[PDB]
Design an enzyme around this catalytic site. Structure first.
Site, PDB file in Angstrom:
ATOM      1  N   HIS A  99      74.458 -12.912  -1.709  1.00  0.00           N
ATOM      2  CA  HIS A  99      73.508 -11.955  -2.281  1.00  0.00           C
ATOM      3  C   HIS A  99      74.107 -10.551  -2.250  1.00  0.00           C
ATOM      4  CE1 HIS A  99      69.087 -10.950  -3.114  1.00  0.00           C
ATOM      5  NE2 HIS A  99      69.878  -9.982  -3.549  1.00  0.00           N
ATOM      6  N   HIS A 145      75.240  -6.938  -3.966  1.00  0.00           N
ATOM      7  CA  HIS A 145      75.263  -5.977  -5.066  1.00  0.00           C
ATOM      8  C   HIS A 145      76.564  -5.192  -5.050  1.00  0.00           C
ATOM      9  CE1 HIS A 145      70.882  -6.326  -5.931  1.00  0.00           C
ATOM     10  NE2 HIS A 145      71.021  -6.945  -4.786  1.00  0.00           N
ATOM     11  N   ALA A 205      69.458  -2.397  -8.408  1.00  0.00           N
ATOM     12  CA  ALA A 205      68.272  -3.221  -8.275  1.00  0.00           C
ATOM     13  C   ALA A 205      68.666  -4.697  -8.208  1.00  0.00           C
ATOM     14  CB  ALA A 205      67.287  -2.976  -9.410  1.00  0.00           C
ATOM     15  N   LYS A 264      71.925 -14.644 -12.180  1.00  0.00           N
ATOM     16  CA  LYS A 264      70.818 -14.110 -11.413  1.00  0.00           C
ATOM     17  C   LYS A 264      69.618 -13.854 -12.342  1.00  0.00           C
ATOM     18  CE  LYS A 264      68.459 -11.889  -8.135  1.00  0.00           C
ATOM     19  NZ  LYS A 264      69.281 -10.764  -7.630  1.00  0.00           N
ATOM     20  N   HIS A 319      66.185 -12.059 -12.123  1.00  0.00           N
ATOM     21  CA  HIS A 319      65.563 -11.003 -11.377  1.00  0.00           C
ATOM     22  C   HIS A 319      64.351 -10.461 -12.128  1.00  0.00           C
ATOM     23  CE1 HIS A 319      65.020  -7.429  -8.933  1.00  0.00           C
ATOM     24  NE2 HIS A 319      66.005  -7.854  -8.142  1.00  0.00           N
ATOM     25  N   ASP A 333      63.185  -7.553 -12.209  1.00  0.00           N
ATOM     26  CA  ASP A 333      63.336  -6.254 -12.865  1.00  0.00           C
ATOM     27  C   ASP A 333      63.857  -6.417 -14.284  1.00  0.00           C
ATOM     28  OD1 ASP A 333      62.558  -5.396 -10.275  1.00  0.00           O
ATOM     29  OD2 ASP A 333      64.375  -4.181 -10.011  1.00  0.00           O
ATOM     30  N   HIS A 350      65.048 -14.133  -8.079  1.00  0.00           N
ATOM     31  CA  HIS A 350      64.119 -13.178  -7.483  1.00  0.00           C
ATOM     32  C   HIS A 350      62.928 -13.232  -8.446  1.00  0.00           C
ATOM     33  CE1 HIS A 350      63.257  -8.643  -6.326  1.00  0.00           C
ATOM     34  NE2 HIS A 350      62.257  -9.072  -7.083  1.00  0.00           N
ATOM     35  N   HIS A 362      66.056 -14.142  -0.837  1.00  0.00           N
ATOM     36  CA  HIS A 362      65.079 -13.501   0.020  1.00  0.00           C
ATOM     37  C   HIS A 362      63.720 -14.182  -0.123  1.00  0.00           C
ATOM     38  CE1 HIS A 362      64.211 -11.670  -3.752  1.00  0.00           C
ATOM     39  NE2 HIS A 362      65.313 -10.922  -3.696  1.00  0.00           N
ATOM     40  N   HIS A 364      64.293  -0.468  -6.293  1.00  0.00           N
ATOM     41  CA  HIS A 364      63.686  -0.848  -7.552  1.00  0.00           C
ATOM     42  C   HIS A 364      63.246   0.327  -8.428  1.00  0.00           C
ATOM     43  CE1 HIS A 364      64.122  -4.975  -6.304  1.00  0.00           C
ATOM     44  NE2 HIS A 364      63.511  -4.703  -5.178  1.00  0.00           N
ATOM     45  N   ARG A 383      54.612  -6.575  -1.152  1.00  0.00           N
ATOM     46  CA  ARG A 383      55.784  -7.307  -0.717  1.00  0.00           C
ATOM     47  C   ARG A 383      55.989  -7.270   0.789  1.00  0.00           C
ATOM     48  NH1 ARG A 383      60.392  -5.666  -5.177  1.00  0.00           N
ATOM     49  NH2 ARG A 383      61.715  -6.019  -3.330  1.00  0.00           N
ATOM     50  N   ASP A 403      72.092  -8.885   0.779  1.00  0.00           N
ATOM     51  CA  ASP A 403      71.439  -8.047  -0.222  1.00  0.00           C
ATOM     52  C   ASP A 403      72.052  -6.659  -0.210  1.00  0.00           C
ATOM     53  OD1 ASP A 403      69.753  -7.540  -2.337  1.00  0.00           O
ATOM     54  OD2 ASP A 403      67.919  -8.106  -1.293  1.00  0.00           O
ATOM     55  N   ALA A 407      71.003  -2.990  -1.719  1.00  0.00           N
ATOM     56  CA  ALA A 407      69.819  -3.093  -2.579  1.00  0.00           C
ATOM     57  C   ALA A 407      68.738  -3.854  -1.820  1.00  0.00           C
ATOM     58  CB  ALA A 407      70.169  -3.791  -3.863  1.00  0.00           C
TER      59      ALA A 407
HETATM   60 NI    NI Z   1      65.822  -9.541  -5.198  1.00  0.00          NI
HETATM   61 NI    NI Z   2      69.251  -8.094  -4.323  1.00  0.00          NI
END
Ligand code: NI
Ligand code: NI
Lengths: 100, 570, 122
Positions: B137, B139, B170, B220, B222, B224, B249, B275, B323, B339, B363, B366
């Site tokens: 995971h 970024h 993000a 991925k 996600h 967003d 995600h 996550h 985010h 969350r 992660d 991020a």
């Molecule tokens: Ni995520």
């Molecule tokens: Ni992430």
């Protein structure tokens, strides 16, 4: 100044010792990296003062005691080694079991 | 002639039945078995055993069973066991685990573990050796994150990003053929193994698939970018055709669906749920119920690991920054706030302990700390021992079963999930020699030496101007494996099969070892080593109480952790 | 209890090295004028020429001491040491070039040893 690589790096040991000394002065029990820094900067400054290697090998055992540091820190540090410019050039100081 | 055990362990590292404390935790691992022949232990040094005509064979050429590198007297901690052995490396790969030395005069030498003229020696006696950590995971936001990860024993970074762009800040996404190619070229200078994830979003196949053909190693999905039923579906259809993993995600907002809608769109296909607790993202409040399903490969990210008294307070602002939310927008704040739940974070501890959440990951940058995946895995296992006791499965005050369960979360399981466990993830013969030595006192905190493809890449080592390498300051430094063209031979760029078959590496001039992503569409929760439990996870929508088998899963936040203020300067 | 980070808790018992192998005690003398220190895994018959001992009793053997340790002979120092048997294929190559093959070839080993002045070929 003409700093070489070691001079630049070793500045950070002095800085870490200063940090650790402020933490000790406000009442904290020191951790591993803090205790190592303090004893290391002690050595280098002692070499700058003109002490001998033999002197610092013995003085290094009396800079911090077990009640200065967190549980298990004494036993984490088997020794501390540092090189500095003595009056007779670069020499290595090895302090065996500095914290009892 | 006999040696007492204390002196034996002092000289050669521990042997059968001896136990070692992990850092300053209350976790104890026990040597399960030892491949040595007492009295013929290999050691290197002035007047030691690995000397020509003695423990070093003076006859054989490198090709004739001789090693490039022997790690002597290692205490291996791996999903496959916790045991004492020599580790023999050749051509960058682990070729023998057993007993190295010279068959001339030693008993029990593993036949392909000859120390010869070509053999380099690393002394592991008194060290714990593990596989390199596999962080799935990641970024890619700041190149300085790589030393941070190496320093805590991570050797593979799977994820996405183009640097500090908001998409990348993000989401673990390197979007499209061109960004992918650019980041594959960038990767030539990163001293760690890498695998890049494309954007798992689209309502047509081609925009998604061309990312895989361009060199992405997975996808991925996600929220967003829109974690809708369509993007989920198209991504899994691409993945099933290309044989790569999809990370999700999900839709925290429940905008286009609730958890059951995401699972319906997934339609039984394999997916890695990132996550899974959900602070890091996902259907509120019950995304963590994904970790009960047989087609889900569940991972946690690290800022909720383990549950501590400061965990909740840090999370609001962290999320808002990651985010790109605005505190002056109430629905943004409501989203953020939904969350962050003590109930699910506390249960997340226990689910790890029960083997229901199979993997850890960072992660990085991020909502996650690049250098704390390994660190927080052990902190969690320690907190669970303290609150829940030794597991039923242990024998004799040893924490071996928990240690194998937990070491698997950041080594073999992420590798299995990603389709790269033929190359990395564990200390087994046939696999790439990514190995981390640890002094037990620093286990899981600060890696001694990180070996990448058979060459040390990263080491805690002292003054370069000194007579010896131990004088201060001892700090983490890149080693010769990261320098010049050696960086190419010691690291793997993992890519899809189609990009490799279409000659992408040659097209872009990639010099790194190319690894093939494969075998990730026919795996499930049952393939997660020591972490293979499927069960009905019930998350109450109104109180967020988590139940498994009718019982509430709760534990307290701790005020202190081991592997923390005893070690760190800041 | 007091935590020493990374400490061992060793099992009970003792480790017997070179188990099941014949042991032989011999008397060895440093007839030279500088110290000689012998490592655990050197074929004993191939040690420095100035060590005086029954060279036949070193063939196919090494010191029965913990791997990586050594026996130290000061100038003129005579002492008893215990040997154990080489294992594996029981072949020795290089070192002093007295064997280069099976250690069963006593006969050849002693002839080379004697010719090159390795003291104690009886
Ligand atoms: Ni995520
Ligand atoms: Ni992430």
């Amino acid at each position: 100044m003409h700093l070489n690589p070691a001079e630049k790096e070793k500045l950070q040991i002095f800085l870490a010792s200063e940090l650790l000394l402020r933490r000790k002065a406000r009442g904290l029990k020191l951790n591993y990296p803090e205790a190592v820094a303090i004893i290391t900067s002690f050595i280098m400054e002692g070499a700058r003062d003109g002490k001998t290697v033999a002197m610092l090998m013995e003085e290094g055992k009396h800079v911090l005691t077990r009640d200065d540091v967190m549980e298990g820190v004494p036993e984490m540090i088997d020794d501390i080694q540092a090189e500095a410019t003595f009056p007779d050039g670069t020499k290595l100081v090895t302090v065996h079991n500095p914290i009892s | 002639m006999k040696i007492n055990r204390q002196q034996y362990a002092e000289s050669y590292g521990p042997t059968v039945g001896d136990e070692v404390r992990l850092a300053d935790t209350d976790l104890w691992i026990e040597v399960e078995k030892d491949y040595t022949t007492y009295g013929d232990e290999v050691n290197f040094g002035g007047g030691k055993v690995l000397r020509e005509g003695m423990g070093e064979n003076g006859t054989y050429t490198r090709t004739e069973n001789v090693l490039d590198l022997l790690l002597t007297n290692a205490l291996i901690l791996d999903y496959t066991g916790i045991y004492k052995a020599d580790i023999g490396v050749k051509d960058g790969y682990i070729v023998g685990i057993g007993k190295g030395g010279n068959p001339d005069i030693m008993d029990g030498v593993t036949p392909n573990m000859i120390v010869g003229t070509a053999t380099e020696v690393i002394a592991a006696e008194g060290k714990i050796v593990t596989a390199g950590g596999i962080d799935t995971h990641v970024h890619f936001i700041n190149p300085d994150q790589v030393d941070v990860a190496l320093a805590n024993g991570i050797t593979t970074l799977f994820g996405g990003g183009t640097g500090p762009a908001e998409g990348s800040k993000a989401t673990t996404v390197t979007p499209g053929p061109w960004n992918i190619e650019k980041m594959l070229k960038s990767t030539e200078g990163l001293p760690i193994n890498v695998g890049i994830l494309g954007k798992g979003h689209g309502s047509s196949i081609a925009p998604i698939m061309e990312q895989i053909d361009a060199g992405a190693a997975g996808l991925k999905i996600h929220e967003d970018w829109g974690a809708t039923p369509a993007s989920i579906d198209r991504s899994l259809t691409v993945a099933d055709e290309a044989d790569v993993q999809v990370a999700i995600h999900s839709d925290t907002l429940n905008e286009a669906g609730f958890l059951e809608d995401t699972l319906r769109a997934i339609n039984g296909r394999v997916i890695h749920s990132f996550h899974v607790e959900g602070a890091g993202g996902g259907h509120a409040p019950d995304i963590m119920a994904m970790a009960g399903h047989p087609n889900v490969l569940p991972s946690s990210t690290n800022p909720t690991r383990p549950f501590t008294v400061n965990t909740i307070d840090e999370h609001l602002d962290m999320l808002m920054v990651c985010h790109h939310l605005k505190q002056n927008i109430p629905e943004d704040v409501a989203f953020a706030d939904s969350r962050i739940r003590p109930e699910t974070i506390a249960a997340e501890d226990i689910l790890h302990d029960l083997g229901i959440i199979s993997m850890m990951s960072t992660d990085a940058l991020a909502m996650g700390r690049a250098g704390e995946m390994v660190l927080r895995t052990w902190q969690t296992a320690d907190k669970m021992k303290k609150q829940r006791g030794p597991l039923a499965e242990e024998k004799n005050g040893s924490d071996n079963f928990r240690l194998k369960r937990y070491v698997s979360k950041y080594t073999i399981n992420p590798a299995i999930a990603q389709g790269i466990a033929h190359e990395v993830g564990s200390i087994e013969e046939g696999k790439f020699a990514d190995l981390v030595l640890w002094e037990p006192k620093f286990f899981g905190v600060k890696a001694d030496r990180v070996i990448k493809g058979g060459i040390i890449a990263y080491a805690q080592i002292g003054d370069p101007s000194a007579s010896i390498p131990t004088p201060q300051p001892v700090m983490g430094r890149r080693m010769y494996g990261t320098v010049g063209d050696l960086i190419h031979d010691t690291n793997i760029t993992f890519m899809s099969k189609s990009s490799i078959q279409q000659g992408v590496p040659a097209k872009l001039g990639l010099k790194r070892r190319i690894g093939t992503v494969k075998n990730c569409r026919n795996i499930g929760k049952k393939d997660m080593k020591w972490n293979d439990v499927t069960t009905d996870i019930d998350i109450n929508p109104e109180t967020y109480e988590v139940k498994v088998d009718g019982e509430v899963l709760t534990c307290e936040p701790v005020k202190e952790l081991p592997m923390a203020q005893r070690y760190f300067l800041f | 209890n007091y935590i020493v980070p990374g400490e061992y808790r060793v099992a009970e018992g003792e480790i017997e090295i070179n188990a099941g192998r014949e042991k032989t005690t011999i008397r060895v003398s440093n007839t030279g004028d500088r110290p000689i220190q012998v490592g655990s895994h050197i074929h004993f018959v191939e040690v420095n020429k100035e060590l005086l001992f029954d060279r036949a009793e070193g063939i196919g053997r090494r010191l029965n001491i913990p791997s990586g340790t050594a026996a130290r002979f000061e100038p003129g120092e005579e002492m008893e040491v215990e040997l154990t048997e080489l294992g594996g294929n029981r072949e020795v190559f290089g070192i002093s070039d007295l064997t280069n093959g099976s250690v069963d070839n006593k006969e050849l080993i002693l002839q080379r040893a004697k010719e090159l002045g390795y003291k104690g070929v009886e």
